Write a protein that binds this ligand. Structure first.
Ligand SMILES: CSC[C@H](NC(=O)CC[C@H](N)C(=O)O)C(=O)NCC(=O)O
Ligand SMILES: [Mg+2]
Length: 439
């Protein structure tokens, strides 16, 4: 037939077409930052964001990305700059071969943003959660997709709006060579994600006060939406492969369908309905590969699968940690012997232990009790493995883990260091964090 409808098998093959041989594996890094007025500390408004984007475009030669008449982002080659719902200012970097390239790319972006921003009296703050302002104090960006989500979140949880408006992450995107490799990396990534959340925890403050968490950001992801989040225990079932992930994603409710430049609100409906040409928001229409990619991009587990794999557990932070986050995971997953060692180390962790670590780390970090010891002790062994993996790559990248070495040695998170400052020299104001963590 001329156009045969997509089938479940085609949606599987879409994911599987991401398989790449080892020499073709790359490292993408994305991170988000809070913009603020240096004088008032107020969150950067859309009109200021548009001036910033336009100036970066003209000065540094980026193409402008528009939604309607509003500039929402920039693109240059395989890099893009985008906005999250609360104005968080994101770089999605290019797929790169080495972590030296990764960190140079972070530096270049930070240099460009500051070159324009400092003339506007704008700074940027790396942290997992906006430390000072209320939910209602955050500007909302003119993006239709976000309008749909903001209206939906209250239906599925009490914290989803804070995820949208108030959080920043640093994430790494990594490749697999086959289904067997994807399964092994997914299981290593999920089991260890709470260790990464702990190493990177930086979000102790809400509305100018300590909030009772080390990573409030991570806690927010447990009250956002139960259908699309979490530790995905089924990944550890013998049955798991591309097919099972596809069935999972098919049954996650949709947000939207993009049709002729516009976002159609599809909430309350599933992609499985769409596949059958039964989707009420688009009666009788059938999905395309773009629709599938768009839907995959609305699922938010601690590790996400698309044509590549995404490690989602880490809080946004200062530049040395932006470069450390991708290095941590490359060290663990990109060496076959280290990957095996990670699977061995975690082989006997139960579903209940993995879930407990995920839920406790946001409060207690590396001081979270685990078995005979503290998570700190698992992290010692994990950090050693990560460093081994980088040594074995032979690119001399191991130094990028210096930034987490003292965290692991002392069992003290970045968030705990900020709390000591807050109760210390800062005189119990969060205001100085806009200096300490200024990019
Ligand atoms: C609109 S909110 C959901 C999701 N955003 C994130 O996953 C952001 C991560 C969050 N800031 C965090 O700190 O974990 C998203 O779709 N971002 C816009 C995009 O497609 O680039
Ligand atoms: Mg983002």
């Amino acid at each position: 037939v001329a156009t045969e409808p997509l089938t479940r098998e085609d949606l599987i093959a879409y994911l599987a077409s991401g398989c790449k041989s080892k020499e073709k594996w790359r490292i993408g890094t994305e991170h988000e930052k809070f913009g603020f007025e240096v004088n008032t500390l107020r969150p950067m408004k859309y009109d200021q964001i548009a001036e910033l984007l336009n100036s970066i475009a003209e000065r540094f030669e980026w193409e402008k990305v528009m939604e309607g008449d509003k500039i929402i982002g920039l693109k240059q080659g395989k890099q893009s700059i985008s906005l999250e719902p609360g104005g968080q200012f994101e770089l999605s970097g290019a797929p790169l071969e080495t972590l030296h390239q990764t960190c140079a790319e972070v530096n270049s972006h930070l240099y460009q943003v500051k070159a324009v921003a400092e003339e506007m009296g704008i700074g940027f703050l790396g942290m997992g959660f906006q430390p000072k302002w209320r939910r209602e104090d955050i500007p909302t960006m003119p993006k239709g997709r976000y309008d749909i989500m903001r209206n939906y979140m209250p239906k599925v949880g009490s914290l989803g709006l804070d995820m949208m408006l108030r959080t920043c992450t640093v994430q790494v995107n990594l490749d697999f060579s086959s289904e067997a490799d994807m399964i092994r990396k997914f299981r290593a990534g999920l089991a260890l994600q709470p260790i990464a959340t702990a190493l990177f925890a930086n979000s102790p403050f809400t509305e100018g006060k300590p909030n009772g968490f080390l990573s409030m950001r991570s806690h927010i992801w447990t009250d956002t939406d139960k259908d699309r989040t979490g530790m995905l225990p089924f990944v550890f079932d013998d049955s798991f492969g591309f097919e099972q992930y596809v069935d999972y994603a098919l049954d996650v409710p949709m947000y939207f369908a993009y049709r002729n430049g516009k976002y159609v609100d599809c909430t309350g409906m599933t992609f499985r309905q769409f596949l059958a040409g039964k989707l009420p928001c688009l009666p009788g229409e059938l999905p395309t590969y773009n629709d599938w990619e768009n839907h995959l991009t609305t699922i938010f587990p601690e590790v996400r699968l698309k044509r590549y794999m995404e490690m989602r557990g880490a809080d946004g932070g200062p530049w040395r940690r932006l470069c450390a986050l991708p290095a941590f995971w490359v060290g663990l997953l990109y060496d076959e012997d280290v990957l095996q060692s990670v699977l061995d180390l975690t082989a006997d962790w139960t579903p209940a232990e993995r879930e407990m670590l995920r839920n406790k780390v946001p409060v207690t970090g590396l001081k979270t009790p685990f078995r005979d010891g503290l998570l700190k002790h698992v992290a010692e062994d994990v950090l050693k493995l990560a460093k081994d993996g980088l040594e074995r790559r032979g690119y001399k990248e191991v130094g990028f883990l210096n930034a987490v070495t003292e965290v692991v040695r002392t069992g003290v998170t970045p968030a705990e260091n900020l709390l000591e400052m807050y109760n210390g020299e800062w005189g119990q104001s969060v205001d100085p964090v806009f200096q300490e963590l200024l990019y």
